[PDB]
Amino acid sequence: PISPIETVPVKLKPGMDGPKVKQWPLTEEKIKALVEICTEMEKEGKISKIGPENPYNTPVFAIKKKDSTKWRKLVDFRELNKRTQDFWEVQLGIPHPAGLKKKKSVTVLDVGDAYFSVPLDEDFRKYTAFTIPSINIRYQYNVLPQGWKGSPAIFQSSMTKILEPFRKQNPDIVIYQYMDDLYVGSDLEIGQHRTKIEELRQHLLRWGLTTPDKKHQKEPPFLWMGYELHPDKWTVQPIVLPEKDSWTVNDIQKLVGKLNWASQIYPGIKVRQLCKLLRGTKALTEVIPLTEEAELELAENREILKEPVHGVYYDPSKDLIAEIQKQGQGQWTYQIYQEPFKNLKTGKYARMRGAHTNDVKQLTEAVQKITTESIVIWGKTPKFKLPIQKETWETWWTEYWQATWIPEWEFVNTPPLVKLWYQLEKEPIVGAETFYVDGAANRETKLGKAGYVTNRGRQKVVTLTDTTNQKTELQAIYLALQDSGLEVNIVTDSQYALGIIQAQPDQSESELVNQIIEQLIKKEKVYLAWVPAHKGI
Amino acid sequence: IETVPVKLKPGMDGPKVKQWPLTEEKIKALVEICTEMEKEGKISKIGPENPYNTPVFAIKKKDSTKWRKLVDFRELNKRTQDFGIPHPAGLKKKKSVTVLDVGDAYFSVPLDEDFRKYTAFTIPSINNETPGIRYQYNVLPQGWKGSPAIFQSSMTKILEPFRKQNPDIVIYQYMDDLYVGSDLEIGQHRTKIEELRQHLLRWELHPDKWTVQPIVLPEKDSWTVNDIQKLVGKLNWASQIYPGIKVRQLCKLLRGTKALTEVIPLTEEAELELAENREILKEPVHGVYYDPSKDLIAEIQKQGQGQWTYQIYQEPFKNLKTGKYARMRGAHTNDVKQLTEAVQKITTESIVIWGKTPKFKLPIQKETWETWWTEYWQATWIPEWEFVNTPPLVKLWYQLEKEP
Ligand SMILES: CC(C)=CCOc1cc(NC(=S)c2ccoc2C)ccc1Cl
């Protein structure tokens, strides 16, 4: 059935013209079917015949429904879609379960073939020209065509208008459109709810939009991209891991993919040894001998995934609480809840060390990421429970070179606490050895020397094969740190070292930097100073 | 009224910037504000057939507890054609200036039909449970560059009387704001401002006090190897600005593997060299002149303890102005607050002085900034910015700025 709604003006992108592709030759059976089917929607007014005044054409296909029984049709709009204008956002984001609120009842109204109910822009219609050839009849769409770029866009806005009055009339009823499904929830008593649904159904019917009756309507639980939605709680469908005897590269990858998704809900899941089987993989279908370490790991993961998890929905009248935990260097797990242990959402992040960072900086980044997803989901920011002392945060941020911040938070004594691994002295140490370190290397030959000399007479130097200047400088610093006692003063002219003085990183991409880092941590008191190069010093 | 045809620069297309997530609190504020404007015919709902978009958000000014809608037309403005438009070099000398929000005036004037599409903006929804509410302007939009331009005529008329009867007062219009400066003492100034308000209805700053501060060098009774080392480093780098600065005589004292704590007596030669350097530092470098055809740039450096330093320049080391900034009372626990405030004051000065907004180089991670800048913004305009890594040397230098 067609509807009396204002068509949305659709034009082809500036400078382009309608489709003109060839029509495939078909079997008499594929033709018979298309003739019959097309005559059907023809009588319905969905499609109208056209003459030679239309030079456009789209390829029509015929595919039997699941397993060669009755015949169905398909139109390949690929080209037309390329020439059609762009519309605004189709779905600017999906509602995450943790952002929903509980309802006494929810019903989904499949407005199925409503696409063919909304009238297309009359002018544009011509571009939808297609043909049913003989073995040895032209048509065009008068309504939104299945597969056409603009259909979903137009269809959505249409439903929006049509529903505007019903929503106003019923501000206690929640509707949510997704594709051709209409999710409607409420907190009314079942009988009342049933009534309003019908009223809605009739309101839609008033615009030709046919919808199924109670006898043919779907109901909860609702499978929503991973979650199993219930009117009072959402559930995570326990993930199944196939116990194979022979594994291929491809298989391992897909496995790790599913496992990595799981880790958000089930922290504890590990894939280190499983990822290790990919090293040097020559082909996607090559078989890999599962290392016992991987067997133990894969097994432990199945136990974890045995216990299904279910949580609660958002309660607007309650505060939001976000707690974070560091599982390892650069790994943080967080869970957001309103009532302790009654989780809304959980998650984790893996931070590739990158250039040079420190745990507090990483904590900061977690806090940041969380704050953002919260705003998108709940429209507000959580109060944070962070495994770090107010003293530590204060010391670090007040002197850090970059602007940084953490919203209202509260320390939670849940080990392991994140702390400052070391802190360079602000002024030279009295009664401490002074190492004047320096390193240089021939850029081209990759050959260098790293060394130092102390005010206490101590000296050293090393020749380095296959090194770079930046490395040499750092190596010098490493040596000074190795041969020095608990207290050390080190002067260098390395501009790169200036980075450490400022950022004081406790993790880096460079293994060498890390060596220095470990040494710095071991020291009681270190004072690092920089002096300009090629001068008197 | 009859509308002037506005167009995009040739070959350009409308902005298609995505909306940032907004808090419940401000989504509400916007919906309310927009339903009202819609009734008043300022804006209209649009369909998906319009693909353009521009970010929107709400802020409350200090001394204001009522939400005010703000749009990010930066992208559009950049694509909107240029169009006579003055800047009084005397406003920079006034004893006092007052900023005025004349944004409302624009809503009276209609916007050319064909350009309206390009002003599309979207009110989002919490958890995407509802489609975005799409609107577009029908009248002149606040924060757009074309608006002050087209309203120019009407504006000059309205002001001419106050102008002719008070040629001793300077009035400058930069977008939604009007800067009124006078040398008249606070009494007459404030009263004359209130009068000017009424004049408009019917239809505190201090400009040169912003004196560039010199770089002061430390003074000790006795200097240590470390002290000298720090000093020499500062100067060596500083020679990029003042080439007359020498550091050899001092560097000479630094020869030898001495302990950093070792006390060193200055040679009469070194003493001179230093005294001479202080002299050169007593005043800003010669040869720096503003070029209206080049972009203005502002660098900011977190100095800790609530202090921040900045430099406005067009070419590196050739600074037009430099200054320090102490955090406002209230932001005692957060940088983002202090930074935005700083950004705002600096942009203002740039306006007063050159009538142009500086491109900022901010010492902050993009994410941190994007997430919270709106929460503290209180200006009708939005300047350009990029995120950078503060070089240790440039920081140590400006740290040495003179104070009262
Ligand atoms: C996202 C989605 C599939 C919603 C329908 O399923 C549920 C939704 C809710 N709660 C809300 S607030 C709702 C219901 C219809 O539309 C909305 C926005 C609760 C339980 C289920 Cl099972």
Where residue B50 sits, what CATH number does that domain have?
Answer: 3.10.10.10
Report the candidate in A483, A488, A434 with the shortest Cα–Cα distance to residue A456.
A434
Q: Where are the beta strands (DSSP E) in A478-521?
A: 487-492, 507-508
CB hemisphere CA count around B358 (13 angstroms): 31
Please answer yes or no on whether A375 and B22 come within 8 Å at the CB atom.
yes
List the end-to-end C-alpha distance of chain A, in Å, as a whole number: 90
Residue B303 at interface with chain A, using a CB cutoff of 8 Å: no
Please answer yes or no on whether A491 and B260 come within 8 Å at the CB atom.
yes
Confirm if A358 and A296 have CB atoms less than 8 A apart.
no
Give, using CA atoms, the residue closest to atom 13 of ligand 1.
A185
Please give the distance of CA A108 from its chain centroid, rounded to a whole number: 27
Spell out the residues 6+ positions from residue B195 whose beta carbon is closer than 8 angstroms to its own.
B162
Spell out the residues 6+ positions from residue B39 whose beta carbon is closer than 8 angstroms to its own.
none
Do B64 and B21 have their domain in common? Answer: yes
Report the candidate in A129, A157, A226 with the shortest Cα–Cα distance to residue A7.
A157
Name the strands in the sheet holding B297-304, side by side, starting at the edge strand that comes first in the sequence: B318-326, B307-315, B297-304, B359-362, B385-387
Q: After which residues is chain A broken (C to N over 2.5 A)?
A: 136
Please give the distance of CA B126 from its chain centroid, rounded to a whole number: 32
Confirm if B44 and B133 have CB atoms less than 8 A apart.
no
**Pairwise CA distance, residues B300 & B309, whole Å:** 6
Residue with the two structure tokens 């940088």: B335
Residue B367 at interface with chain A, using a CB cutoff of 8 Å: yes
Give the CA distances from residue A244 to residues A100, A241, A280, A290, B187, in Å, rounded to whole numbers and listed in that order: 38, 9, 22, 10, 88
Residues on chain B touching A455 (C-beta within 8 angstroms): 257-259, 262
Confirm if A420 and A503 have CB atoms less than 8 A apart.
no
List the end-to-end C-alpha distance of chain B, in Å, as a whole number: 56
Report the candidate in A190, A180, A264 with the shortest Cα–Cα distance to residue A220.
A190
Strand pairing report for B68-71 and B56-59: antiparallel
Fill in the amino acid letter for A327.
Answer: Q
Indicate the SS3 state at residue B267.
coil
Please answer yes or no on whether B363 and A402 come within 8 Å at the CB atom.
yes
Give, using CA atoms, the residue closest to atom 1 of ligand 1.
A95
Looking only at Cα atoms, what is the longest distance across chain A? Answer: 104
**Pairwise CA distance, residues A409 & B312, whole Å:** 36
Give the closest of B18, B24, B127 to A96, CB-based: B127
Is B404 within the bounds of a domain? no
Please give the distance of CA A102 from its chain centroid, rounded to a whole number: 25
**Pairwise CA distance, residues A468 & B46, whole Å:** 61
* Residues 123 through 162 of chain B touching chain A, CB cutoff 8 Å: 124, 126-132, 134
Do B352 and B336 have their domain in common? Answer: yes
Is B166 within the bounds of a domain? yes
Indicate the SS3 state at residue A442.
strand
Give the closest of B251, B259, B338 to A535, CB-based: B251
Do B192 and B60 have their domain in common? Answer: no
**Pairwise CA distance, residues B354 & B358, whole Å:** 10
Confirm if B340 and B385 have CB atoms less than 8 A apart.
no
Give the CA distances from residue B118 to residues A154, B25, B77, B226, in Å, rounded to whole numbers and listed in that order: 20, 27, 11, 61
DSSP B292: T
**Pairwise CA distance, residues B160 & B26, whole Å:** 39
Looking only at Cα atoms, what is the longest distance across chain B? Answer: 82
Confirm if A295 and A302 have CB atoms less than 8 A apart.
no
Q: After which residues is chain B broken (C to N over 2.5 A)?
A: 83, 203
DSSP A323-379: EEEEEETTEEEEEEEEETTEEEEEEEEE----SEE-HHHHHHHHHHHHHHHHHHHHS
Last residue in a domain, options B248, B265, B290: B290
Residue B341 neighbours by CB distance under 10 Å: 19
**Pairwise CA distance, residues B347 & B297, whole Å:** 10
Confirm if B265 and B250 have CB atoms less than 8 A apart.
no
Please answer yes or no on whether B251 and A537 come within 8 Å at the CB atom.
yes
**Pairwise CA distance, residues B35 & B43, whole Å:** 9
Last residue in a domain, options B290, B318, B333: B290
Do B350 and B361 have their domain in common? Answer: yes
Residue A179 at interface with chain B, using a CB cutoff of 8 Å: no
DSSP A193-254: HHHHHHHHHHHHHTTT-----GGG-B-SSEEETTEEEETTEEEEPPPP----SSEEHHHHHH
Is B186 within the bounds of a domain? yes
Please answer yes or no on whether A498 and B248 come within 8 Å at the CB atom.
no
Residue with the two structure tokens 């950004």: B343
Strand pairing report for A138-141 and A47-49: antiparallel
- Token pair belonging to B80: 């909107």
- Token pair belonging to B400: 């040495």
Report the candidate in B342, B351, B349 with the shortest Cα–Cα distance to residue B377.
B342
How remote is the CA of residue A184 from the centroid of ligand 1, in Å? 7
DSSP B60-108: --TT--S-EEEE--HHHHHHBPP------TTTTT-SEEEEEE--GGGGG
* Residues 128 through 157 of chain A touching chain B, CB cutoff 8 Å: 153-154, 156-157
Give the closest of A10, A93, A434 to B260, CB-based: A434
Closest CA in chain B for residue A154: B48
Do B3 and B39 have their domain in common? Answer: yes
* Residues 96 through 115 of chain A touching chain B, CB cutoff 8 Å: 96, 99-100
Rg (C-alpha) for chain B, rounded Å, is 26
Do B63 and B192 have their domain in common? Answer: no
Report the candidate in A531, A530, A503, A529 with the shortest Cα–Cα distance to residue A517.
A503
CB hemisphere CA count around B66 (13 angstroms): 2
Indicate the SS3 state at residue B110.
strand
Q: What CATH number should be reported for the domain holding residue B312?
A: 3.30.70.270
Q: Is A180 annotated as a binding residue?
A: yes
Do B312 and B362 have their domain in common? Answer: yes
Spell out the residues 6+ positions from residue B153 whose beta carbon is closer than 8 angstroms to its own.
none
Report the candidate in B323, B342, B399 with the shortest Cα–Cα distance to residue A403.
B342
**Pairwise CA distance, residues B131 & B140, whole Å:** 26
For A41-73, b/e burial (b = at least 16 CB within 10 A) is beeeebbeebeeebebbbbbebeeeeeeeebeb
Confirm if B351 and B357 have CB atoms less than 8 A apart.
yes
Cβ-count burial of A241 within 10 angstroms (0-12 exposed, 13-18 middle, 19+ buried)?
middle
Report the candidate in A424, A426, A434 with the shortest Cα–Cα distance to residue A537.
A434
Residue A362 at interface with chain B, using a CB cutoff of 8 Å: no
Do B4 and B138 have their domain in common? Answer: yes
Report the candidate in A106, A111, A96 with the shortest Cα–Cα distance to residue A159.
A111
Angle at B228 between CA B226 and CA B231, to 5 degrees: 110
Last residue in a domain, options B290, B321, B353: B290
Name the strands in the sheet holding A525-530, side by side, starting at the edge strand that comes first in the sequence: A433-436, A487-492, A525-530
Closest CA in chain B for residue A361: B365
Is B135 within the bounds of a domain? yes
Give the CA distances from residue B223 to residues A513, B44, B229, B279, in Å, rounded to whole numbers and listed in that order: 33, 72, 10, 20
Residue A496 at interface with chain B, using a CB cutoff of 8 Å: no
Residue A160 at interface with chain B, using a CB cutoff of 8 Å: yes
Confirm if A309 and A323 have CB atoms less than 8 A apart.
no
**Pairwise CA distance, residues B401 & A261, whole Å:** 53
Spell out the residues 6+ positions from residue A170 whose beta carbon is closer than 8 angstroms to its own.
A196
Domain count across chain B: 4
Closest CA in chain B for residue A454: B257
**Pairwise CA distance, residues A95 & A176, whole Å:** 10
Please answer yes or no on whether A428 and B395 come within 8 Å at the CB atom.
no
Q: What is the resolution of this structure in A?
A: 2.9
Do B142 and B23 have their domain in common? Answer: yes
Give the CA distances from residue B294 to residues A243, B349, B359, in Å, rounded to whole numbers and listed in that order: 67, 17, 11
| CA quadruple A359, A364, A366, A367: dihedral sign | positive
**Pairwise CA distance, residues B34 & B40, whole Å:** 10
Domain range enclosing B101? 90-106+148-179
Residue A501 at interface with chain B, using a CB cutoff of 8 Å: yes
Residue A111 neighbours by CB distance under 10 Å: 21
Do B260 and B174 have their domain in common? Answer: no
Is B199 within the bounds of a domain? yes
Q: Where are the beta strands (DSSP E) in B156-276?
A: 169-174, 177-182, 223-224, 263-264
Please answer yes or no on whether A530 and B233 come within 8 Å at the CB atom.
yes
Give the CA distances from residue A151 to residues A154, A329, A504, B46, B221, in Å, rounded to whole numbers and listed in that order: 5, 49, 56, 17, 82
Indicate the SS3 state at residue B159.
helix
Residue A463 neighbours by CB distance under 10 Å: 10
**Pairwise CA distance, residues B169 & B166, whole Å:** 6
Q: Bridge partners of B401?
A: B215
**Pairwise CA distance, residues B338 & B327, whole Å:** 6
Is B403 within the bounds of a domain? no
Is B264 within the bounds of a domain? yes
Give the closest of B21, B262, B395 to A375, CB-based: B21
Report the candidate in B78, B105, B110 with the shortest Cα–Cα distance to residue B5.
B110
**Pairwise CA distance, residues A213 & A191, whole Å:** 15
Which positions of B make up the binding site for Mg(2+)? 101, 176-177
Please give the distance of CA A258 from its chain centroid, rounded to a whole number: 14
CB hemisphere CA count around B240 (13 angstroms): 13
Fill in the amino acid letter for A426.
Answer: K
**Domains along chain A?**
1-90+116-151 (3.10.10.10), 91-115+152-220 (3.30.70.270), 221-314 (3.30.70.270), 315-421 (3.30.70.270), 422-535 (3.30.420.10)
Confirm if B115 and B73 have CB atoms less than 8 A apart.
no
Residue B371 neighbours by CB distance under 10 Å: 21
**Pairwise CA distance, residues A513 & B394, whole Å:** 24
Confirm if B93 and B207 have CB atoms less than 8 A apart.
yes
Give the CA distances from residue B308 to residues A337, B182, B348, in Å, rounded to whole numbers and listed in that order: 38, 30, 17
Residues counted in chain A: 537
CB hemisphere CA count around A15 (13 angstroms): 0
Fill in the amino acid letter for A181.
Answer: D
If DSSP states are collapsed to H, E and C, what string results for A256-287? HHHHHHHCCCCECECCHHHHHHHCCCCCCCCE
In terms of phi and psi (left: phi > 0; alpha: psi -120 to 50; beta: otherwise), the region of B362 is beta
- The residue among A12, A100, A402 with the most chain B CBs within 10 A of its CB, best to mutate, is A402
Virtual CA dihedral for A361, A362, A363, A366, nearest 10 degrees?
130
Fill in the amino acid letter for B255.
Answer: R
DSSP A32: H
Indicate the SS3 state at residue A512.
helix
Residue ranges of alpha helices (H) inside B80-224 are 113-116, 146-150, 152-164, 186-201
Do B155 and B256 have their domain in common? Answer: no
DSSP B182: E
Residues on chain B touching A534 (C-beta within 8 angstroms): none
Residue A398 at interface with chain B, using a CB cutoff of 8 Å: yes
Kindly report each contact of residues A257-265 with a partner whose C-beta sits within 8 Å and lies 24 or more positions away, as own/partner.
Answer: A259/A301, A261/A226, A262/A301, A262/A305, A263/A348, A264/A346, A264/A347, A264/A348, A265/A236, A265/A309, A265/A346
**Pairwise CA distance, residues B180 & B195, whole Å:** 12
How remote is the CA of residue B129 from the centroid of ligand 1, in Å? 9
Is B344 within the bounds of a domain? yes
Q: What residues flank ligand 1, with Cβ below 6 Å? A: A 95, 100-103, 106, 174, 176, 183, 185, 220, 222, 224, 229-231; B 129
Do B12 and B44 have their domain in common? Answer: yes
Indicate the SS3 state at residue A513.
helix
Confirm if B354 and A391 have CB atoms less than 8 A apart.
no
Atom of ligand 1 nearest to the CA of A100: 12
Virtual CA dihedral for A365, A371, A372, A375, nearest 10 degrees?
180
Q: Before B88, cis peptide (omega within 30)?
A: no
Residue ranges of alpha helices (H) inside A99-211 are 150-169, 190-205
Report the candidate in A487, A332, A357 with the shortest Cα–Cα distance to residue A421.
A357
Indicate the SS3 state at residue A85.
coil
